[PDB]
Every structure is written in structure tokens, then in C-alpha cells.
Design a protein around this ligand. Sequence first.
Ligand SMILES: Nc1ncnc2c1ncn2[C@@H]1O[C@H](COP(=O)(O)OP(=O)(O)O)[C@@H](O)[C@H]1O
Ligand SMILES: [Mg+2]
Lengths: 337, 12
Amino acid sequence: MPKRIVYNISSDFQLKSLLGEGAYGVVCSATHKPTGEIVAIKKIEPFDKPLFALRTLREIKILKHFKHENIITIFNIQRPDSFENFNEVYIIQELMQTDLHRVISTQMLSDDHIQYFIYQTLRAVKVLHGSNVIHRDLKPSNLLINSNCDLKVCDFGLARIIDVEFVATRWYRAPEVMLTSAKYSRAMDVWSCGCILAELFLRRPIFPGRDYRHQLLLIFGIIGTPHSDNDLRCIESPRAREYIKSLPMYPAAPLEKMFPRVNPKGIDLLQRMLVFDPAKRITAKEALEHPYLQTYHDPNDEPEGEPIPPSFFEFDHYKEALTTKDLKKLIWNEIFS
Amino acid sequence: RRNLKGLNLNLH
Ligand SMILES: Nc1ncnc2c1ncn2[C@@H]1O[C@H](COP(=O)(O)OP(=O)(O)O)[C@@H](O)[C@H]1O
Ligand SMILES: [Mg+2]
């Protein structure tokens, strides 16, 4: 608990431990002394640039909207004592014990744990997708975990509604997104989930590219290089098509041979997630129905969600960009509702 | 609810 970490919240809270620290968010566990409850508090300074406030607002609205076992629970947002003195946002959430990046880094997981963690991840993705929401930044550190193996997705500020920026880690980015201006889609999240499932099997990232070029080499070295015009149907950009054509002609790698001790049903699911053509990639609902996850699948207990209209993030579509003060008011409205 | 096998992680 570094002394440098300062939270301008009620003295009823006593910070306990620093859980995460980045340019956008700082997350600490803290004890709410009056009740004894230990919670997680995510602090964000949203007002130096609109970009930060936009991420904050998307995050808060998505957290408040969903009530799902695999989406981290928001308890409340602290109330500033005045609009003039509102400089940081403090999101109070249910406290989880760790995250999946730390778990994969420190624990040997059985095939049963892997089934269970990817099942829960996909169950969260299914409700987001059925609500026309894509996360766009799925990776192990954004999957929160308790010792009983409960898993909940977090970090929703890069989400978008189907129909300078913070950029999702390239290691989990779908190839069509990296290649084209392609309208981000549900399939991009399924690709990231395939990278997560592979990371669970390998105990390391499957495509740790050093840069754009290396990322594509690593991806195609495993899924095979697209070469026929049909293979390239989803790539309109002439620059992108020529670049793919300049790559070595890799065949799809025989994953069952490379990783012979992995459950073959797990490899099959993984292969269906890491497909180049987004229209042929498995959906989250189909993945929950896959044989690898039969132990946990229940078609009557996998919430589909309800569509959210683009206007839910109307602030992202203004002819004239909203000002920081404009966004401060929209965030205030979420805190007090 | 469906953690049939009582899966757990020894986390400290
Ligand atoms: N509710 C929570 N309980 C426990 N740890 C959390 C919680 N929320 C976040 N964390 C920890 O903080 C890290 C960063 O949180 P995250 O919400 O992803 O913010 P950032 O936008 O800075 O990536 C997570 O990877 C996790 O280790
Ligand atoms: Mg994060």
C-alpha cells in the first residue's frame, strides 16, 4: 500500500492493498470501516482529456446495466461533495481475490479448471453479445477470479455497441481488426477468447507479437495463411490484401500434434475460435454448446441479454466533440442515478 | 452453482 496512492474518499474507508496501477485506472482493496466489508475501489482521473472521460462513462454505464454472475458487480460510485471539487471517479465493486493472468502465471490448472474458466468467460460474452455489446479488450487480466473459481469479466470502457484512443493489447486482437478498418464485431471477442483458451492450455500467450508484422506472422503460422480469393473475401483494403499475399504460405498447424496432452475436445473448440474468417468463427452461444464444455452447459441458465441501442453511447457520435465539462456532467448523472 | 467438482485454487 504505497503512500503515494491517494484516494479522495470518505475517511470511513481505509485502503488495504494496491491491486492494479495503470495510466487509466488504479485499483485497491479497502475496508469500509463502519460495516467491516472489504471492497475493491477503482480510481480514475477522467478530466485531463475527453478520451479518459469517455472510457470512464462507457465503463460505468456497462457496469450499471448488467446484473450477471460473470460480470463484476458494481456496488456504487462515490459521491463528490461538489461539482467544482469533482476531479476523480471512485467505482466501488465487489472485491475478487485475483485475476486470470496472475492465476495462469502462478498455478498449474487441471483440464477441469480450464473448462470451467473458459465456460464462465463465454457465458459473460454471450450476454454482452446478445445485448449488442462487444468488449474489445478481453484478456486474462480483465477476468477476475476467486478461490472457489468464480470468474467475472471487468474493464468495460473500450466496449462498443454494434451499429487518439486506448488500444487493446495486440496479442489478443483478431486478425481482421489488425488488418482492416473492419467494423469491430462479436467475432473479434470470440477470437480474444480463443487466445485466452490457448493461454490456459500453454500457460503463456499463444501469439506474443513484438509488433504488427510479427503478430500477423505468429497468427498465420498457426491458423494457416489465407490465399484464395475466397480466403480473402473479408478483406476489402487493397493494401491489406497485398500484405497478406507477401506472407510465407503457412498451412494450418496440427495443434493436436503440437500439444498432445491437451484434451482433444479442447483443441477442437480452440480451432473453431481461431478461424481467420470472422463469419466462420464459432459464436459464444455455439461455444457454450460445444462438447468440451458439456459438464457446465445449461441452455436454460445462460442469459442471452436484450439489445441495447447505439444511443446508449450517444456521446460518442456528436458532430461536434463533447467538451470535458459536457462529459463531467454525463458522468455526474450516472453517479447520482 | 455448477462447480460440481468443487474446483478450487489455493490462493493466499
Ligand atoms: N473488483 C476487483 N477485485 C479485485 N481485483 C480487481 C478488481 N477490479 C480490478 N482488479 C485488479 O485490477 C487490475 C486492473 O483493473 P481493470 O479494471 O482491468 O483496470 P485497467 O483499466 O487499469 O486495466 C485487474 O487486472 C485486477 O488485478
Ligand atoms: Mg484491465
